[PDB]
Design a protein around this ligand. Structure first.
Ligand code: HEM
Ligand SMILES: O=C(c1cnc2c(-c3cnco3)cc(C(F)(F)F)cn12)N1[C@@H]2CC[C@H]1COC2
Length: 438
């Protein structure tokens, strides 16, 4: 009853889109079994995301914190909603995402991208179907594990299948917790719970190896794990460390994979844009196998294509803030203690904010084009924006540039362009393609 006065009805994000269009900038919805208010004016996005006064609503992150009674991300960087506790860990972990830190990762990005392209080139017979979703997820995982933890997962070589299965089931668990046959319930619970335990045990094992390497005086390059450890200096137990281990293990590859998959999917029906991209990579990097850091800024058209991919297909569709006190938002009285839902997915597909919103047009992000003002936020905005944004943008440019340099992709007929909402948004189908060398 406290929300019944708010406009509203008498993937789920498309239903929200329809309702925002019909009912306006402030609409009551039910999401993850709780009443929320979707706020879609740019004035609101600015007000709430650009102030440290407004913090995340913990209740809407419960499925990341713990699933079926197993601690998952716990109080790591994404799911910690207390400002002071978040701030302390953010400032320490930020050191691993410095300009100098990120420049040193180019070798890893290049090596894993080159490995992917070589594997794909051997299958480029115009006939063999290849799941680009799977290949790009393995590439993202292998990049993350090496870059962040000094670990070789070698998923591109077909290694670590138990780990890959663990990740899949954990993501299914997050999804089931936020939605949802007795025999079905039993096996599901068992497999999800054991997968989460496996992931934290991977953390424990790798932290032990790192500590042992340091004690023996071995060479350990400073990385994300260094700063995750530094954040926990003098903690009473290792649960905080393992929260962030798992947070970065998953966050550091899943969304990047989703974004790569969506971009490959969309480009399969954009032959003219693909031709322009091919020309750009040919002109900027030539025959070089390796992209230098300075080359990345020169791939201007690719940058624009990637921005446009995130407008229509943001893997993380939005964020929540807790409204503590009753507040008038765009003419609507919103009671205190209410989760406010912000969605870059919904705003990206609204004609009020983007002309011909379903048209894929990289020119929207061109040098002379007016920039979206608080209508576009695939990495979010403000203090709780993505710590990995520049890491992600670099890795995906490296991977895409090397694909475009060497291969042509055709989507297998019957493959769909639709989305599914699991723990993130991702393509519904495996992005099955046939390949030829350029
Ligand atoms: C295209 C790739 C990526 C997209 C679209 C993306 C998107 C986002 C979004 C929308 C948020 C805000 C989430 C929220 O408010 O609940 C976020 C936060 C975060 N992301 Fe990313 N992300 C990407 C890549 C990465 C990578 C590569 C890493 C780590 C290496 C990463 C680690 C994080 C962490 C730790 C947070 C929490 C930040 C904080 O609250 O201080 N993400 N991401
Ligand atoms: O679950 C998330 C969320 C947000 N960010 C992430 C990331 C992430 C960020 N950067 C890299 O990865 C990874 C995942 C994971 F499932 F893959 F683990 C989930 N999330 N939520 C958003 C939208 C609905 C829900 C609650 O509100 C805010």
């Amino acid at each position: 009853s406290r929300y019944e006065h708010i406009p509203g009805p008498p993937v789920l994000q498309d239903v929200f889109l329809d309702w925002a269009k019909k009912y306006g900038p402030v609409v009551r919805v039910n999401v993850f079994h709780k009443t929320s208010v979707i706020v879609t004016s740019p004035e609101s996005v600015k007000k709430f995301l650009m102030s440290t006064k407004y913090n995340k609503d913990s209740k809407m992150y419960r499925a990341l914190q713990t699933v079926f009674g197993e601690r998952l991300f716990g109080q790591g960087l994404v799911s910690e909603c207390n400002y002071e506790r978040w701030h302390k860990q953010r400032r320490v972990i930020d050191l691993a995402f410095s300009r100098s830190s990120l420049v040193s990762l180019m070798e890893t990005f290049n090596e894993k991208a080159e490995q992917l392209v070589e594997i794909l080139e051997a299958k480029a017979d115009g006939q063999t179907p290849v799941s680009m979703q799977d290949m790009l997820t393995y590439t993202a995982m292998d990049i993350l594990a090496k870059a962040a933890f000094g670990m070789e997962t070698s998923m591109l070589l077909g290694a670590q299948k138990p780990l890959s299965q663990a990740v899949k089931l954990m993501l299914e668990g997050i999804t089931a917790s936020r939605n949802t046959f007795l025999p079905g319930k039993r096996k599901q619970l068992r497999e999800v719970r054991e997968s989460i335990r496996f992931l934290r045990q991977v953390g424990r094992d790798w932290v032990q190896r790192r500590r042992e390497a340091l004690k023996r005086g071995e060479e350990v390059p400073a990385d994300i794990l260094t700063q995750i450890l530094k954040a926990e200096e003098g903690a009473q137990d290792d649960e905080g460390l393992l929260d962030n281990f798992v947070t970065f293990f998953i966050a550091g590859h899943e969304t990047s994979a989703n974004h790569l998959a969506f971009t490959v999917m969309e480009l399969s029906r954009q032959p003219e844009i693909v031709a322009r991209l091919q020309a750009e990579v040919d002109e900027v990097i030539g025959s070089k196998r390796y992209l230098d850091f300075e080359d990345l800024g020169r791939l201007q058209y690719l940058s624009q294509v990637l921005k446009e991919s995130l407008r229509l297909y943001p893997p993380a569709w939005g964020t929540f803030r807790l409204l503590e006190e009753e507040t008038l938002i765009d003419g609507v009285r919103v009671p205190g203690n209410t989760p406010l839902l912000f969605s870059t997915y919904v705003m990206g597909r609204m004609d009020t904010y983007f002309e011909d919103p379903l048209t894929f047009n990289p020119d929207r992000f061109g040098p002379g084009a007016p920039k979206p003002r608080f209508t576009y936020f695939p990495f979010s905005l403000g203090h709780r924006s993505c710590i990995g944004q520049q890491f992600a943008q670099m890795e995906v440019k490296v991977v895409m540039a090397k694909l475009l340099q060497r291969l042509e992709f055709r989507l297998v007929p019957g493959q769909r362009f639709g989305l599914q909402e699991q723990a993130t948004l991702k393509p519904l189908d495996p992005v099955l393609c046939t390949l030829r060398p350029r």
